[PDB]
Design an enzyme around this catalytic site. Sequence first.
Site, PDB file in Angstrom:
ATOM      1  N   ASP A  14      25.757  40.433  97.479  1.00 59.24           N
ATOM      2  CA  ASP A  14      26.236  39.374  97.026  1.00 59.24           C
ATOM      3  C   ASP A  14      28.254  39.371  97.305  1.00 59.24           C
ATOM      4  O   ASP A  14      28.771  40.999  98.014  1.00 59.24           O
ATOM      5  CB  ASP A  14      26.260  39.068  95.453  1.00 59.24           C
ATOM      6  N   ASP A  16      31.124  37.325  94.949  1.00 58.94           N
ATOM      7  CA  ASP A  16      31.835  37.249  93.401  1.00 58.94           C
ATOM      8  C   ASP A  16      30.853  38.632  92.634  1.00 58.94           C
ATOM      9  O   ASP A  16      30.109  38.800  92.598  1.00 58.94           O
ATOM     10  CB  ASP A  16      31.657  35.698  93.098  1.00 58.94           C
TER      11      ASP A  16
END
Length: 247
Positions: A14, A16
Site C-alpha cells: 500500500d 499512504d
Amino acid sequence: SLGLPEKVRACLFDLDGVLTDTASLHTKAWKAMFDAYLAERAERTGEKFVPFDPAADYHTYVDGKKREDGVRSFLSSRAIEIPDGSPDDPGAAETVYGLGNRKNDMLLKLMRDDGAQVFDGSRRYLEAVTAAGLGVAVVSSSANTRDVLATTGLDRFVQQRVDGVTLREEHIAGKPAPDSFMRAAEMLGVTPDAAAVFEDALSGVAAGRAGNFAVVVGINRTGRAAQAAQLRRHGADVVVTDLAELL
Ligand SMILES: [Cl-]
Ligand SMILES: [Cl-]
C-alpha cells in the site's frame, strides 16, 4: 530473509502510511469533510451531531478502501444512505461521488502545501527488496499514487501499479476484496502464494488474507496496542511499527 519466507518472490505495498508519510493527510481530509457534512446534516434534520473519529471511524470504515466505498461504509455506520450520484458531481452535492470529490478537494489543498515524504525505513526496505531481486508493486486506492511515486522518486523501485485510477478504469473491486492485490500479482507474473502484502489498513490486511497471500504484513504507526490487535485479527501474520524492523 527480509522477514519473508523463501518462497516469496514479490512484494505488494500500500502507499499512504506504508511507503509515504501521507496517511495523516488523508485522515485529516476525511475528518474535515465528514465533520462538515455531518454538521450540515444535523442543521437540516435536527439529528444529533457526532463527529468523525479519526482513529476508530477512519481505521474501521474508510482506511484503504476505494474512495466511494469509504464514503458509503462510514455513512452506513451512522445509518445514513445517500444517492451515489455521478463521478463529476461537485463537492457541494449530497451524493457519494460528491462527498468523495469534496474530500479529494481537501486532500489536494493539504498536499500542495506539504508534499509527500517517504518513511526512511520504507526507503531502506524497498532498497533491500530490490537488491534481493524481488518484484515490487504498489496497490493503493489513492488516485494520486502515480504522481506521489513520481515526485518522491519511489517509482524507481516499483515495477507495477494498481491504484485508484486502475480500480475505476478496469472496474476492480477495492479492499477488502483481494482483487486488486491479485491483479498486481498477475502483472508481476507471480501467484499469491509467492507474494507478500504490506498494509496499514485493516481492509487491506483482510484483502491479503482473502487472497491467500504467502505473508500479510501489517504496519501499525499509531503507537497503540489496539490497532496491532485489529491488524492481527483481520489477517496479518506479522505486525511491525516500521518496515526497518524486518531488516
Ligand atoms: Cl483518492
Ligand atoms: Cl510479528
